Amino acid sequence: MHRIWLMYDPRRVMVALVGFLAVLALVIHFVLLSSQRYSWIENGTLGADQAPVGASAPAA
Amino acid sequence: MHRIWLMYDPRRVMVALVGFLAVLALVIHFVLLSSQRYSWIENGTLGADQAPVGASAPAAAAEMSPLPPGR
Amino acid sequence: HRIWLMYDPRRVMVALVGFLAVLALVIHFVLLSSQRYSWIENGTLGADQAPVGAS
Amino acid sequence: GMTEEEARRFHGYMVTGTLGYVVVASVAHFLAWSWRPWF
Amino acid sequence: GMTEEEARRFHGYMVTGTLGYVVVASVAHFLAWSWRPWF
Amino acid sequence: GMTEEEARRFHGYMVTGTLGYVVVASVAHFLAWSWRPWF
Amino acid sequence: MMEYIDGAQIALYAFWLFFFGLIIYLRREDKREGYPLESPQGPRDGWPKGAPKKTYVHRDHG
Amino acid sequence: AMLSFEKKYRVRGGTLIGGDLFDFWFGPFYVGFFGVTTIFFVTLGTLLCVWGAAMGPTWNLWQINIAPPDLKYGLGLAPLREGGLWQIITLCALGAFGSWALRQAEIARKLGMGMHIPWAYGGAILAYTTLVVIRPFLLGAWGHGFPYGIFSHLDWVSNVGYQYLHFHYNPAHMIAVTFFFTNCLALAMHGSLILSVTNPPKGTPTGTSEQENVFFRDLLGYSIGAIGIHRLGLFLAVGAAVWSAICIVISGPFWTQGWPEWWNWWLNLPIWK
Amino acid sequence: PTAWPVDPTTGQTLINGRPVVGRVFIMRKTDGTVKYPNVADVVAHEALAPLPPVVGSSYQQAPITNQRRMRGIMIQSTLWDMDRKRSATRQRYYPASTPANQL
Amino acid sequence: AATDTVQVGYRGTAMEQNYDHGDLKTKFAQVKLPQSPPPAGESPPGPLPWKNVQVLNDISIAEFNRTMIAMSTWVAGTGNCAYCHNVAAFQDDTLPNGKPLYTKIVARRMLQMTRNINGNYSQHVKNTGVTCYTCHMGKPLPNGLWFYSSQTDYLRHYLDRDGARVITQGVAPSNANRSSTKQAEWTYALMISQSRSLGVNCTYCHNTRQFASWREAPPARVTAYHGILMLRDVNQNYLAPLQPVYPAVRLGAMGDAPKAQCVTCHNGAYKPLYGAQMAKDFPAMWGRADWNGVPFPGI
Amino acid sequence: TRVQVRTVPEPGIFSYLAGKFGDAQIGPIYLGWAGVLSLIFGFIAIEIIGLNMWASVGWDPVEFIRQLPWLALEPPPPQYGLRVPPLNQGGWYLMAGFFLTVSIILWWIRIYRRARALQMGSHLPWAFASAIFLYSTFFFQPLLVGSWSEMVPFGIFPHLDWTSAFSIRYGNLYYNPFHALSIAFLYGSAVLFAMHGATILAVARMGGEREIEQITDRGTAAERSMLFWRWCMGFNATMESIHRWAWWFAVLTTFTGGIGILLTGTVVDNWYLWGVKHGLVAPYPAQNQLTPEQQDLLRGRYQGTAPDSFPSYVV
Numbered sequence A: 001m002h003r004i005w006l007m008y009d010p011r012r013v014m015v016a017l018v019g020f021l022a023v024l025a026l027v028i029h030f031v032l033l034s035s036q037r038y039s040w041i042e043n044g045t046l047g048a049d050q051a052p053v054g055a056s057a058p059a060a
Numbered sequence B: 001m002h003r004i005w006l007m008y009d010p011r012r013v014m015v016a017l018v019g020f021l022a023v024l025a026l027v028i029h030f031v032l033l034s035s036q037r038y039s040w041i042e043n044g045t046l047g048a049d050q051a052p053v054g055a056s057a058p059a060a061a062a063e064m065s066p067l068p069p070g071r
Numbered sequence C: 001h002r003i004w005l006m007y008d009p010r011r012v013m014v015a016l017v018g019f020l021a022v023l024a025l026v027i028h029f030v031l032l033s034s035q036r037y038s039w040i041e042n043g044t045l046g047a048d049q050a051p052v053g054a055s
Numbered sequence D, E, F: 001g002m003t004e005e006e007a008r009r010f011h012g013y014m015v016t017g018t019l020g021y022v023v024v025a026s027v028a029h030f031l032a033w034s035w036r037p038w039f
Numbered sequence G: 001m002m003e004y005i006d007g008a009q010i011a012l013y014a015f016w017l018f019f020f021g022l023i024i025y026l027r028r029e030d031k032r033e034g035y036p037l038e039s040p041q042g043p044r045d046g047w048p049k050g051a052p053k054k055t056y057v058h059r060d061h062g
Numbered sequence H: 001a002m003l004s005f006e007k008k009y010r011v012r013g014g015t016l017i018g019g020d021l022f023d024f025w026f027g028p029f030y031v032g033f034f035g036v037t038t039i040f041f042v043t044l045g046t047l048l049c050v051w052g053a054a055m056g057p058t059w060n061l062w063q064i065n066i067a068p069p070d071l072k073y074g075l076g077l078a079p080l081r082e083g084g085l086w087q088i089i090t091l092c093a094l095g096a097f098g099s100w101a102l103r104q105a106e107i108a109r110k111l112g113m114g115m116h117i118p119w120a121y122g123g124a125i126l127a128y129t130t131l132v133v134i135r136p137f138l139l140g141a142w143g144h145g146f147p148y149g150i151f152s153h154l155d156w157v158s159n160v161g162y163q164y165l166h167f168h169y170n171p172a173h174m175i176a177v178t179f180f181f182t183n184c185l186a187l188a189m190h191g192s193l194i195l196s197v198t199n200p201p202k203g204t205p206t207g208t209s210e211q212e213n214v215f216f217r218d219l220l221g222y223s224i225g226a227i228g229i230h231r232l233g234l235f236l237a238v239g240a241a242v243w244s245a246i247c248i249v250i251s252g253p254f255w256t257q258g259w260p261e262w263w264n265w266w267l268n269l270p271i272w273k
Numbered sequence I: 001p002t003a004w005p006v007d008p009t010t011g012q013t014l015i016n017g018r019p020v021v022g023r024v025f026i027m028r029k030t031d032g033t034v035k036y037p038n039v040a041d042v043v044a045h046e047a048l049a050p051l052p053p054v055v056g057s058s059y060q061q062a063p064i065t066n067q068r069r070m071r072g073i074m075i076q077s078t079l080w081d082m083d084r085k086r087s088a089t090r091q092r093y094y095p096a097s098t099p100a101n102q103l
Numbered sequence J: 001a002a003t004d005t006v007q008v009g010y011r012g013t014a015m016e017q018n019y020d021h022g023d024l025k026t027k028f029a030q031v032k033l034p035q036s037p038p039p040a041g042e043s044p045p046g047p048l049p050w051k052n053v054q055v056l057n058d059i060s061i062a063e064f065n066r067t068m069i070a071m072s073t074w075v076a077g078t079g080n081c082a083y084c085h086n087v088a089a090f091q092d093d094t095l096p097n098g099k100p101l102y103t104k105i106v107a108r109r110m111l112q113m114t115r116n117i118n119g120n121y122s123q124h125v126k127n128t129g130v131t132c133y134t135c136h137m138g139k140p141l142p143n144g145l146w147f148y149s150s151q152t153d154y155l156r157h158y159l160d161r162d163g164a165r166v167i168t169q170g171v172a173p174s175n176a177n178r179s180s181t182k183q184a185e186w187t188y189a190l191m192i193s194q195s196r197s198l199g200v201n202c203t204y205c206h207n208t209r210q211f212a213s214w215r216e217a218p219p220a221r222v223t224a225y226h227g228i229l230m231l232r233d234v235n236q237n238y239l240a241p242l243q244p245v246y247p248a249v250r251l252g253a254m255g256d257a258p259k260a261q262c263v264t265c266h267n268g269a270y271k272p273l274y275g276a277q278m279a280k281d282f283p284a285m286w287g288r289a290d291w292n293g294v295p296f297p298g299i
Numbered sequence K: 001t002r003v004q005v006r007t008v009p010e011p012g013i014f015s016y017l018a019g020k021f022g023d024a025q026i027g028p029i030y031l032g033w034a035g036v037l038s039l040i041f042g043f044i045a046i047e048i049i050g051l052n053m054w055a056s057v058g059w060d061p062v063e064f065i066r067q068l069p070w071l072a073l074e075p076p077p078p079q080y081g082l083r084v085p086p087l088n089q090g091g092w093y094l095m096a097g098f099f100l101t102v103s104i105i106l107w108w109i110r111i112y113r114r115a116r117a118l119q120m121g122s123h124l125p126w127a128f129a130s131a132i133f134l135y136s137t138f139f140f141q142p143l144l145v146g147s148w149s150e151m152v153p154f155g156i157f158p159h160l161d162w163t164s165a166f167s168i169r170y171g172n173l174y175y176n177p178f179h180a181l182s183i184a185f186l187y188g189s190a191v192l193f194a195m196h197g198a199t200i201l202a203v204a205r206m207g208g209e210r211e212i213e214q215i216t217d218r219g220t221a222a223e224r225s226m227l228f229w230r231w232c233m234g235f236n237a238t239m240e241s242i243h244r245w246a247w248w249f250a251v252l253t254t255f256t257g258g259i260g261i262l263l264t265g266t267v268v269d270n271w272y273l274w275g276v277k278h279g280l281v282a283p284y285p286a287q288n289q290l291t292p293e294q295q296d297l298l299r300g301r302y303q304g305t306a307p308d309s310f311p312s313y314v315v
C-alpha cells in the first residue's frame, strides 16, 4: 500500500492531515464545552449521576 | 467496468470522492445533532423508550393562535 | 443505441449523476420538512398514528 | 474519440447500472410504502 | 493518460475499499439501530 | 518524486504514527467514558 | 409671508438649474470626438453643439 | 446619423438568434432580435404602468403607486386591480432587462469586444430578481415584492428595514454599504487622476502614465496600474450589488429576528463567553 | 345617501330620476385611496400636538455606583439585552469610591 | 425552516410580521401543554363564614374555595396552600412564631391589583383579561422583573417618567419641539424593548414612513399606549409600595421592590399566553359587573 | 498573466525611482510638512477615541476587543448647547473632533501641494473637498441647531445608531429631496464605474486601458468603446469626457448630501410633512381612525429629563 506515496507527495499530505486533525479536534472540544452535559471546565468534578441530561419524552 | 478509470483520472477521483463523503458525513451528523430525538451529546444516555418522539399531532385551545391576527 | 455517438458519455455521466444527486436531496428535504414524513423525529410512529392533512 | 464499438459496450453497462439503480429504488419505495403509505 | 494495466489494478483497490467502507458503515448502523432505532 | 525504498520507509512511520495516535485516542475515550459516559 | 415657498424648495430648484447646466456642459464635452455626424442629408451636430477638437502638446525632450 | 468614423464598423454578424433578419440600425440604435423584444416589453410594461396610474388616485408623478397583491394570494396571479397588474409589469420588466443584456452581447460581439459589459449588468438584474422573484418566492408570496412608485417603494424599503428593528446591524448590509462607499471614492480618485494629467494647469505639458502612477502611489501607498484600477472599479461596483442581493435575501427567508441579536454569536466566542 | 334611489317596481337603480340597465356600483380609485389635500388635513386626522416636556428644576447626582461607564444611549437595548457575561456586567457601572478617612 | 408571515398593513407597504415556523411551534407547544386546567364552578347559598377576608367579600363560599385552588395552582403548585398560609389557621396573617406571612400579605395586594387591571384597564386587556397565571406561569417569580439602576434606564417609562415623543407635528422647526437626537435614540431603545417583549417588529404598531402617525398605524398602537398607562398604575400603586413587605432577598440593590414591564405578561408573544382566555372563568378576579355580558355571580 | 516582468534598475527612469519630476521628489511616499502634521494631529484624535472607548469598559482588554463595535466616544449632553462640557461628558469628544478636523484639512493641503508639484490639474483636491464638505456639515448642522449633543458619536455601531435616530427625529429622511438626490448620485457612481470598468476591460485586448494615449491619439479601442454605447443607448461619451461624468457623479454625491444635512432641523423639521406639503407622499387607506377624545388622550409629551432620584413609594 506504500505505493500510494508514489502517487501523492508526503510533503503535501502530511500538512493536510495535521491541518484536518487539528481542526476536527478543536471543533469537537468546543462543541462539547458549549454543551450542558460536558461543560467540563465548570462541571468536570460532578459525578456521572450528577451531570445534566437532556429532556426525556413525557409520553402522556 | 475498470475502463471507467480510462475516462476519469483516478488521482483526481479520490480527492473528489473523499470530499463528497466528508461533506455528507458532517451534514448527516449535524442534522441529527440538531434534532430532538438524536441530540446525543445531551440525551444519548436515555433509553430508546425515553428518547423524544415527534407528535402524532399538535394541539391547541380554540381561542389560542400561534400567529397574530392579520389580513 | 447509437446515442452515445451524439453526446459524450464522459459528460452525460457527470451531468446525470449530478442531476440525480440534486433530485434525491430535494425529495429527502421536502419529505423531512413535511409533517407526515419527518422521519428523524417521528419515524417510529405507526402508519395509523402518523400525521395526515385535513379532510 | 468515441466509436460504435465503444458506444455498444458503454451502453451495455449503462443499461445494467440503470436497471440496478431502478431495482434498488423499487425496493426502497416498497419498504417506505410498507412503513407509511402515501396513498 | 491511463493504461489498462493501471486501470484493472486500480479498480481492485477502489471496489475493495468501497466495499470495506460500506461494511464498516453497516456495523455502525447495526450499533446505532441497537441503541436508538429510527423506525 | 520519491523512490519505493523511501516510500517503504515512509509508510512504515506513517502507519506507526497512525497506530500510536489511535492508541492514545482510545485511552482518552475510555477515560472519558469512565468519567461520564455518553450512552 | 410665503406659505408654500420654503428654503428647501428654493434650494432644490437652484440645484436643478445647476444640474441641467452641467448636463449641457458634459454633452458638449462628449462631442469633441466623432462629430459632426455623417448623414444622408449632410452633416449633423445634434444638440448641444459640440466643443471643438482638442490638440495636446507633449513635454519636449529635445 | 453616424459618427465620422462609424460606417466602417456597421457590418453584419455577431447576432445570437435572429441571423440577418433584424441585423440593422435605427438612428444610432442597434436593433437585432433582442432590440425587437426589448421594445415590445418596454412598451407593454410602460403602458400597463400608465394604466396603473390611470386607475389610481392621482397622476402626480411622485405619488403614482402600482402595489403588489396581498400576501393571501400566495404565489398565484391576483386580480389585476388587486395587484395582478403589478405581477404582469414585473414579467415585462424581467423580459426587458434580460433582452437588454442579450442585446448588449450582440453589440459587443459585432465590435470584437469582450462580454464584460453584459455580465456586469447581470449584477443589477440579479439584485432586481432577488427583490421581486427570489425573496418573494422563498417567503411564499409575490406580495413581498416592492411597489412600483417613485416614493412608495421608499416606504417599502423603510418598513422592510424596521421589520428587523435595526437593519444597520445586518452584516451583509454593512459589507454592501462599504462597497458602495468605497466605489464612490475610487470613482472620484480615478476620474480626478485622468482629468488632471489630460488637463494640466494652463501652460503645462500634457501629463503621462508615470505621473498618475506616482501620484496614485502617494495616495494609497501602492501602484495599482491602468488595468488594475478598472478591475477594481468593476469589482467594487458589481460586488456592491451582489452583497446587496445577499443582504436582502437573508432578511426573512433565513433570519427573522432583529438584526442586532444576530451578533450574539460574537459575544459568545469561547475565548471570552 | 350612500346609494342611488331604487325603483321598487322594476328594482332598477334610478340616477337623476331615470333608470339604469345593470347593477350600479359607486366608482372609486384603487382600494378607495384619496390624495392627501395638504399638511393641515393630514394633521387634522392625527392626535393633538404633544404636551411640553417635564424638565427638572435642578440636577442631583446619583451615587457613583449608579453612574454608567458607557454613555452610548442605545447600549441597554443593542448590547445589554443579550450580553449577560458576569465580568462585562460588572464593568457597566463605576465601582464604589470613598475618601480614605471614611474607611 | 419555513417562515410564517402575517400581513398587518396595506398592500406593498411591507407592514408584515415574520415568524420562524419551527421556533414558533416550539414556543406555542411549551405554552399549551403546561396550560393549567380550571376547576368547574358551583352556586351554594348562605352567609359568609370568613374571619380575615378583605378583598373576596363578594363571591360565594364555593367560588372562594375554587379561587384558592386556582391561586395555588397558578402561583405555588396545585396543592400548596402552605405557600401562603399557616395551614392550621387560614385566617392568620402571621406564622406561629408571630413573624408575618409575607406571601399572604402580597397575595392580598395582588388580588386588588388583578381586579384593578381587569376593571380599570379593559381598554388594554379587553375580554381576555389577566389572572395570576398570566405573570406567574405557575411560579412565585414572574419574568421581566426590574429594579432601579441608572437614571437613564428606559424602563422608568413604566414607573415615574412621562413623555416619549420627539417628532415635530409641523414642517418648520419651532420652540414647541426641541428634542435631541439623543432623545430619539432613547425612544428607539425603548421601542426595541417593546418590540422584543411581544415578539413583533416596529411595523406591528407603526407605518415607519411616519412613526408619529396614528391614522397610518395599525390599531394595536392604541392598545400599546394603554399598556403604558396600565404599567404606570400597576408599578406605582401596587408593586413598588410592597417594599417593606418582602424579605431583603427579593429587593434590588437600592432596596426597591421588583417592578413589572410588558414582557412580564406578554413573555415574547403578541398576546399573553397566545390569547388564552382564563379570566372569564374566575369571577373573583373580574373587577367588573359582567364579563363579555356574563353577569357577576354576586354572593 | 503568469509571465511577470521584474525590473532591477529603476522604472520611471520590482523597484522605484529616487529622483525628481521638477519640484516633486520621487521615491518615498510623500508627506511634506502638511502630511507630517496631519499624521500627528490625526494620531492624537485616534488615541483619544480609543482610550475613551477602552476606559468605558473599565480598561478590560478582553471586553475592549469583545465589545469593540459597541463602544463609543459620545458627544456632550444637550442642555450645554454650544458651551464647553465636562471632560467625561463630551469634553474628550470635542477635543477628538477638533484634532480630526485639523488632521483632515492638513491632509487636503498635503494632497493639493502634491498635485501642483507633479504639475497636475487640481481635480483631485476639489473632489476631496466635496467629501470634506459633507463631513463638515456634521459640525455645522449641530452648530446651526445650537447644541453639540447633535454631533455624531465616534464608534462603529454607535454612529449607525445616530444615523437611524437622526432620520427618526427629523421625520423620515427618505423625504428629504437632497438625500434622494444624493442617493441617485451614489447609485449612479456604481452604474458608471461598472459600465466604465467593464468597457475598458472589454477593449483592453486592443490597448484601451492606455487611456491617456487613447485621449491624445484616438485608437480603435476608443472608437469601439464609443460605438458600443452609441449603439446600445443612442448616445456616447469620449475617452476623456467619461472621466468627467465619473468625477461629477462622485462629487455630487457628497455635495448634495451636505446640503440635505444643513437644511435638516434648520429649515425643515419633519421631512415627511414637507413631502405632504409638496406632494411627494403616496396615499394609503387609513389603518386606524381616532375619535376626538382619543386625539387628546393619545397625544403624548415631548421627552424630558431623566429622573434624578430613586423614589421610595413608602405609602
Ligand SMILES: CCCCCCCCCCCCCC(=O)OC[C@H](COP(=O)(O)OCC(O)COP(=O)(O)OC[C@@H](COC(=O)CCCCCCCCCCCCC)OC(=O)CCCCCCCCCCCCC)OC(=O)CCCCCCCCCCCCC
Binding pocket: G020, G021, G023, G024, G027, G037, G044, G045, G046, G047, G048, H001, H002, H026, H027, H028, K184, K188, K233, K234, K235
Ligand atoms: C433640451 C433643452 C432644455 C435644456 C435644459 C434641460 C435639459 C438639459 C439636458 C439637455 C441634454 C441634451 C438633450 C438632447 O437634445 O440630446 C440630444 C441627444 C441625441 O444625440 P445627438 O448627438 O445630440 O444628436 C444626433 C441626432 O440629432 C441625429 O442623429 P439621428 O437622426 O440618427 O438621431 C435620432 C435622434 C432623434 O432625436 C431625438 O429623438 C431626441 C430625443 C431626446 C429625448 C430626451 C428625453 C428627455 C426626457 C425623458 C423623460 C422620461 C421619459 C420616460 O436621436 C435619438 O435617437 C435620441 C438618442 C438619445 C436617447 C436618450 C434616451 C433617454 C436619455 C435619458 C432620459 C432621462 C432619464 C432620467 O440625446 C442625448 O444625448 C440624450 C441623453 C443625454 C442626457 C443623459 C442624462 C442622464 C442623466 C441621469 C442622471 C439623473 C439624476 C437625477
Ligand code: BCL
Binding pocket: H157, H181, H184, K049, K100, K104, K131, K132, K134, K135, K154, K162, K163, K164, K165, K166, K167, K172, K173, K174, K178, K179, K182, K183, K184, K186, K253, K254, K256, K257, K258, K260, K261
Ligand atoms: C434610517 C437611516 C436613514 C438614513 C440616514 C442618513 C443620514 C443621517 C445621512 C445619510 C446620508 C447618505 N445616505 Mg441615507 N439613510 C437611510 C437610507 C439610505 C439608503 C437606502 C437604500 O435606504 C441609501 C442608499 C442611502 C444613502 C446615503 C448616501 C447617498 C448619503 C451619504 C453619502 C456619502 O458618500 O456618505 C459617506 C461619505 C462621508 C461620510 C464623507 C466622509 C469624508 C471625510 C473627510 C472622511 C474622513 C476619514 C477619516 C480621516 C478617517 C479616520 C476617522 C476616525 C477613525 C474617527 N441612505 C435612511 C432613510 N443617510 C448622508 C447625507 O448626505 O444625508 C443627506 C447623512 O448624513
Ligand SMILES: CC[C@H]1c2cc3[nH]c4c(c3C)C(=O)[C@H](C(=O)OC)c4c3nc(cc4[nH]c(cc(n2)[C@@H]1C)c(C(C)=O)c4C)[C@@H](C)[C@@H]3CCC(=O)OC/C=C(\C)CCC[C@H](C)CCC[C@H](C)CCCC(C)C
Binding pocket: H038, H041, H042, H043, H044, H045, H046, H049, H089, H092, H093, H096, H097, H100, H117, H118, H120, H121, H122, H123, H124, H147, H148, H149, H150, H151, H153, H237, H238, H240, H241, K187, K190, K191, K194, K195, K198, K232, K233
Ligand atoms: C451592478 C452594479 C450597478 C449597475 C450597473 C449597470 N447598470 C447598467 C449597466 C451596468 C453595468 C448597463 O450596461 C445598463 C446600461 O445600458 O446602462 C446605460 C444598466 C442600466 N442601469 C439602469 C438603471 C439603474 N441601475 C441601477 C443600479 C446598478 N447598475 C448597480 C448598483 C439602479 C438603481 C440602484 O436604482 C438603476 C435605476 C439603466 C439606466 C440601464 C438598463 C436599461 C434597461 O434595462 O433598459 C430596458 C428597459 C427600459 C428602458 C425600461 C423598462 C420599463 C419596464 C418594462 C416597466 C417599469 C418596471 C419597473 C420595475 C418600475 C420601477 C419603478 C420605480 C419607481 C421603482
Ligand SMILES: CC[C@H]1c2cc3[nH]c4c(c3C)C(=O)[C@H](C(=O)OC)c4c3nc(cc4[nH]c(cc(n2)[C@@H]1C)c(C(C)=O)c4C)[C@@H](C)[C@@H]3CCC(=O)OC/C=C(\C)CCC[C@H](C)CCC[C@H](C)CCCC(C)C
Binding pocket: H181, H182, H184, H185, H188, H189, H219, H220, K036, K038, K039, K040, K041, K042, K043, K046, K103, K104, K107, K108, K111, K124, K127, K128, K130, K131, K250, K251, K253, K254
Ligand atoms: C467624492 C465622495 C467620496 C470620497 C472622496 C475622497 N475621499 C478621499 C479623497 C477623495 C477624492 C482623497 O483624496 C482622500 C485620500 O487621501 O484618499 C486616499 C480621501 C480620504 N477619504 C477617507 C475616508 C473616507 N472617505 C469616505 C467617503 C468618500 N470619500 C465619498 C464616498 C468615507 C466614508 C464612506 O465614511 C471614509 C471613511 C480617507 C481614507 C482619506 C483621507 C485621509 C485623511 O484625511 O487622513 C487624516 C489622518 C489621519 C486619520 C491620521 C492617521 C494616523 C495614523 C494611523 C497613525 C500612525 C502613527 C504615526 C506615524 C505617528 C506620527 C509620527 C510622525 C513623525 C509621522
Ligand SMILES: *[C@H]1O[C@H](CO)[C@@H](O[C@@H]2O[C@@H](C)[C@H](O)[C@@H](O)[C@H]2O)[C@H](O)[C@@H]1O[C@H]1O[C@H](C(=O)O)[C@@H](O[C@H]2O[C@H](CO)[C@@H](O)[C@H](O)[C@H]2NC(C)=O)[C@H](OC(C)=O)[C@H]1OC(C)=O
Binding pocket: J052, J089, J091, J092, J093, J094, J095, J096, J097, J098, J099
Ligand atoms: C401570628 O401573630 C398574629 C398576631 O400578631 C396572630 O393573629 C391572631 O389572630 C388574629 C385574627 C388576631 O387579629 C390577632 O390579634 C391574633 O389573635 C397569629 O395567629 C399568629 O400568632 C402566633 O404569634 C402570635 C404573636 O403575635 O407573636 C402569638 O401571640 C402571643 O405572643 C405574643 C408574643 O410572642 C404576644 O404579644 C401576644 O399577646 C400573644 N397573644 C396570644 C393570643 O397568645 C400567638 O400565640 C398564641 C397562643 O396565640 C401565636 O399563635 C400560635 C398558635 O402560635
Ligand SMILES: *[C@H]1O[C@H](CO)[C@@H](O[C@@H]2O[C@@H](C)[C@H](O)[C@@H](O)[C@H]2O)[C@H](O)[C@@H]1O[C@H]1O[C@H](C(=O)O)[C@@H](O[C@H]2O[C@H](CO)[C@@H](O)[C@H](O)[C@H]2NC(C)=O)[C@H](OC(C)=O)[C@H]1OC(C)=O
Binding pocket: I054, I055, I056, J160, J161, J162, K304, K305, K306, K307, K308, K309, K310, K311, K312, K313
Ligand atoms: C425623585 O425626585 C425626582 C426629581 O423631582 C423625580 O423626577 C421628576 O419626575 C420624573 C418623572 C421626571 O422624569 C423628572 O424630570 C423630574 O421632574 C423622581 O420621579 C422622584 O420623585 C419623587 O421625589 C420628588 C422630589 O423632587 O423630591 C417629589 O417631587 C415633589 O416634591 C419635591 C420636594 O421634595 C418638589 O420640588 C416637587 O416639585 C414635587 N413634585 C410633585 C409633582 O409633587 C415626587 O413627589 C411627587 C408627588 O411627585 C416624588 O415622587 C414619588 C412618587 O415619590
Ligand SMILES: COC(C)(C)C/C=C/C(C)=C/C=C/C(C=O)=C/C=C/C(C)=C/C=C/C=C(C)/C=C/C=C(\C)CC/C=C(C)/C=C/C=C(\C)C(=O)O
Binding pocket: B001, B002, B003, B004, B007, C020, C023, C026, C027, C030, D006, D009, D010, D013, D014, D017, D018, D021
Ligand atoms: C415538487 O417536485 C417534487 C414532486 C418534490 C419532485 C419532482 C420530481 C420529478 C418531476 C422527477 C423526475 C425524475 C426523472 C425523470 O425522468 C428521473 C429520471 C431518472 C433516471 C433516468 C435515472 C437513471 C439512472 C441511471 C444510472 C444510475 C446509471 C448508472 C450507470 C453506471 C453505474 C455505469 C457506469 C459507467 C460505465 C460502466 C462506463 C465504464 C466503461 C467504459 C468507459 C468502457 O467500457 O469503455
Ligand SMILES: COC(C)(C)C/C=C/C(C)=C/C=C/C(C=O)=C/C=C/C(C)=C/C=C/C=C(C)/C=C/C=C(\C)CC/C=C(C)/C=C/C=C(\C)C(=O)O
Binding pocket: A003, A004, A007, B014, B017, B021, B027, B028, B031, C024, C025, C028, C029, C032, E006, E009, E010, E013, E014, E016, E017, E018, E019, E021
Ligand atoms: C439529512 O439527510 C439527508 C442528507 C437529507 C438524507 C439523504 C442523503 C442522501 C441522498 C445520501 C446519498 C448517499 C450516497 C449515494 O450514492 C452515497 C454514496 C457513497 C459512496 C459511493 C461511497 C464510496 C466510498 C468508497 C471508498 C471509501 C473507497 C476507498 C478506496 C480505497 C481506500 C482504495 C485506495 C487505494 C489506492 C489509492 C491505491 C491505488 C493504486 C495504485 C496507487 C497503484 O496501483 O499503483
Ligand SMILES: COC(C)(C)C/C=C/C(C)=C/C=C/C(C=O)=C/C=C/C(C)=C/C=C/C=C(C)/C=C/C=C(\C)CC/C=C(C)/C=C/C=C(\C)C(=O)O
Binding pocket: A021, A027, A028, A031, B025, B026, B029, B030, F006, F009, F010, F013, F014, F015, F016, F017, F018, F021
Ligand atoms: C460534533 O460531532 C461531529 C464532529 C460533527 C461528528 C462528525 C465526525 C466526523 C465526520 C469525523 C471524521 C473523522 C475522520 C475522518 O476521516 C478521522 C480520520 C482520522 C485520521 C485519518 C487519523 C490519522 C492520523 C495519523 C497520524 C497522526 C500520523 C502520524 C504519523 C507520524 C507520527 C509519522 C512521523 C514520521 C515521518 C512521517 C517520517 C517519514 C520518513 C521519511 C520521510 C523518510 O524515512 O525518508
Ligand SMILES: COC(C)(C)C/C=C/C(C)=C/C=C/C(C)=C/C=C/C(C)=C/C=C\C=C(C)\C=C\C=C(C)\C=C\C=C(C)\C=C\CC(C)(C)OC
Binding pocket: K046, K047, K049, K050, K051, K054, K094, K095, K097, K098, K101, K135, K136, K138, K139, K151, K152, K153, K154, K155, K156, K159
Ligand atoms: C493605546 O492605543 C489604543 C489601543 C487605544 C489605540 C486604539 C484605538 C482604537 C481601537 C480606536 C478605534 C476607533 C474607532 C473604531 C472609531 C470609529 C469612528 C467612527 C465610525 C466615526 C464616525 C463618524 C464620526 C463623525 C462624523 C464625527 C464628526 C466630528 C466632527 C465634525 C467634530 C468637529 C469638531 C470641531 C470642528 C471642533 C471642536 C472644538 C471647538 C471649536 C468646538 O472648540 C471646543
Ligand SMILES: [Fe+3]
Binding pocket: H190, H194, K196, K200, K211, K243
Ligand atoms: Fe478610465
